[PDB]
Amino acid sequence: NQKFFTLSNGNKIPAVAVVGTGTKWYKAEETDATFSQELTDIVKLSLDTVPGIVHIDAAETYKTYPELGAALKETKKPREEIFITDKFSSLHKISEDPKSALETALNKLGVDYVDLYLIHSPFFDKDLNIDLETAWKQLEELYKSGKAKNIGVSNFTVEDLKKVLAIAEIKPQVNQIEFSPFLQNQTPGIVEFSQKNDILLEAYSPLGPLQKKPTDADQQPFYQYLKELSEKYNKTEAQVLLLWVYKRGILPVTTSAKIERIKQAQDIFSFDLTEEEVKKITDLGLQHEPVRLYHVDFYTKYNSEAQ
Numbered sequence: 391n392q393k394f395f396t397l398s399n400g401n402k403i404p405a406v407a408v409v410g411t412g413t414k415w416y417k418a419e420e421t422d423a424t425f426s427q428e429l430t431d432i433v434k435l436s437l438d439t440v441p442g443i444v445h446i447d448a449a450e451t452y453k454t455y456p457e458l459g460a461a462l463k464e465t466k467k468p469r470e471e472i473f474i475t476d477k478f479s480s481l482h483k484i485s486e487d488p489k490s491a492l493e494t495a496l497n498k499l500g501v502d503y504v505d506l507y508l509i510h511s512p513f514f515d516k517d518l519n520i521d522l523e524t525a526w527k528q529l530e531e532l533y534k535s536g537k538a539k540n541i542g543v544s545n546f547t548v549e550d551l552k553k554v555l556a557i558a559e560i561k562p563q564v565n566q567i568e569f570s571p572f573l574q575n576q577t578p579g580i581v582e583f584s585q586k587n588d589i590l591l592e593a594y595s596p597l598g599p600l601q602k603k604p605t606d607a608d609q610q611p612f613y614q615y616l617k618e619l620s621e622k623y624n625k626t627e628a629q630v631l632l633l634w635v636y637k638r639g640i641l642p643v644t645t646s647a648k649i650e651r652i653k654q655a656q657d658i659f660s661f662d663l664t665e666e667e668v669k670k671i672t673d674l675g676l677q678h679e680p681v682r683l684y685h686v687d688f689y690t691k692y693n694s695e696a697q
Contacts, residue, residue: 392442393659395641397563398588401540403506404473405636407445407592408655409436410645411454420453428647429454433461435649440656443471447594447643449510450479450491455498463500474501477510477544477566480525483517488528492537507538508566512550513688522550523557530560540564542589545685547577551589562589568684569593569640571612571631571675572602576685578695585639595683596635596642597628602681612674619671623661626654630671633658637668 394402411433417424437444444467448458462472476495478488485491492507509525520528532538542564543554554562565584567576569591575581584591595601599612607613619630628644632655635642644655663671680696682689 391659392656393636395590397540397590398561399540399563401563403540403564403590403641404443404445405641406632406655406658407447407473407475407641407643408440408646408652409433409444409446410643411446411448411452411458412645413452413454414647417453420456424453426454426457430457430460432647432649432652433458434465436652437461437465437467437472439649440653442656443473444656445473445475447475447645448495449477450484450495451477451482451510453484455495459499459501469501473505474499475506475508475566476504477508478525478529480509480514480518481511483515486518487520488525488532492532496537503537503539506540506542506564507532508542508544508564509546511545511685512543512547512553513545513685522553526554526558526562530558533560542566544592545576545688546580548579548583551583551587561587564590564592564641566592566594566643568595568598568682569635569638570596570598570681571634571671572599572678572681573696574672574676575692575696576682577689577692581638581640590641591639592641592643593635594643597631597644598681598683599631599675599678600628601683612678615670615674619663619667625658625661626651629654629658629661630663633661633663634668634671637663638672 393405478491529541533541542562544566620627632642680693
């Protein structure tokens, strides 16, 4: 039942990521006191009970490698039935460079490789002693050594991708961006450019519209239609939006702490949307004001082009 995207290198990636590792409260330090039993328990439960290949989206910045590592050790879910995406913290330095970050992560996770490694932001912390070019080249070496089965970037503009393409031996395989019906181009032209250049887009915060659901939702065309589709298919509104992202050729990344929502996200491929329905979600979304939840200070200037 599970669907996959095929990356430019021929490798497959599960077409929805359903396990996220954010502490609901930002985690400032890594101590026994800050270890989140609640997070480790939901990751373990997901690995135990979610059918098929379970795609986890992790990140150095979360400081939840210990919780992911404990869950990975305690599950009997086999390693090959897990796809682990990890991200080098470029915005806020924790490691000197990608090589150091991933070496540390592999040891904390208790694993030999990650399935996808991303540069989390093109906007490097002033405290980092490495530039974008040098970081990408480190990802190329982690790809060649097999520590990262696939490599890519996150929150890159067209100009950022062009900077990588100018020095790349290995073309980035993924660009994880914020994408939803209320933000259909995180930065100008990114969707069209990425898809034309065989760089797979992942969409984080694809459920932004449901987070920022206004209290007049019952009277808003977008939310009215989303409810109509939910009722038509006997699926949740979340499931309809996640499937819409997939139908736009983009891999939705979601991060619920409710096991039934995690299972529902994995199960989006239990139905389909017609061409009309995909187009109508798109069109009603584009009529809406942009909603941007991440990289706000960097990309506000692009809001006028996002829809």
